[PDB]
Design a protein around this ligand. Structure first.
Ligand SMILES: [Cl-]
Length: 118
């Protein structure tokens, strides 16, 4: 036709999506060498990408044993999604002090339910 549906923004109010603003940063930290001020350090560093609402550092057990492996997962919630993705693109697949890190978007609902397992 003439693109009429787009031109009149037909049904646009139904089609809005909420975007996650949460980044998960993986493999950044050895679990045996965790800075006391890690949360603050991450907070300040991430200010190079956007307004940071909060940071949670989570030491995740990989099993139930007393000696189960620990993996450090760093969550950063930014004010807006464009900031989250700026941070992800600056970090993901890159090396820091001999560690190759993974940075990805994390589901907002899971984060807001304190489900830090993914
Ligand atoms: Cl991205």
């Amino acid at each position: 036709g003439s693109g009429s549906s787009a031109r009149h923004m037909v049904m646009q109010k139904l089609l809005r999506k909420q975007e996650s603003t949460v980044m998960v940063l993986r493999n950044m930290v050895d679990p045996k060498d965790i800075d006391d001020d890690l949360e603050g350090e991450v907070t300040e560093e991430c200010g190079k990408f956007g307004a940071v609402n909060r940071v949670i550092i989570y030491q995740e057990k990989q099993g139930e044993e007393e000696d189960a492996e620990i993996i450090v997962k760093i969550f950063v919630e930014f004010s807006i999604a464009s900031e989250t993705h700026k941070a992800i693109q600056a970090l993901n697949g890159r090396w820091f002090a001999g560690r190759k890190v993974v940075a990805e978007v994390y589901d907002q609902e899971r984060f807001d339910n304190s489900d830090l397992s993914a």
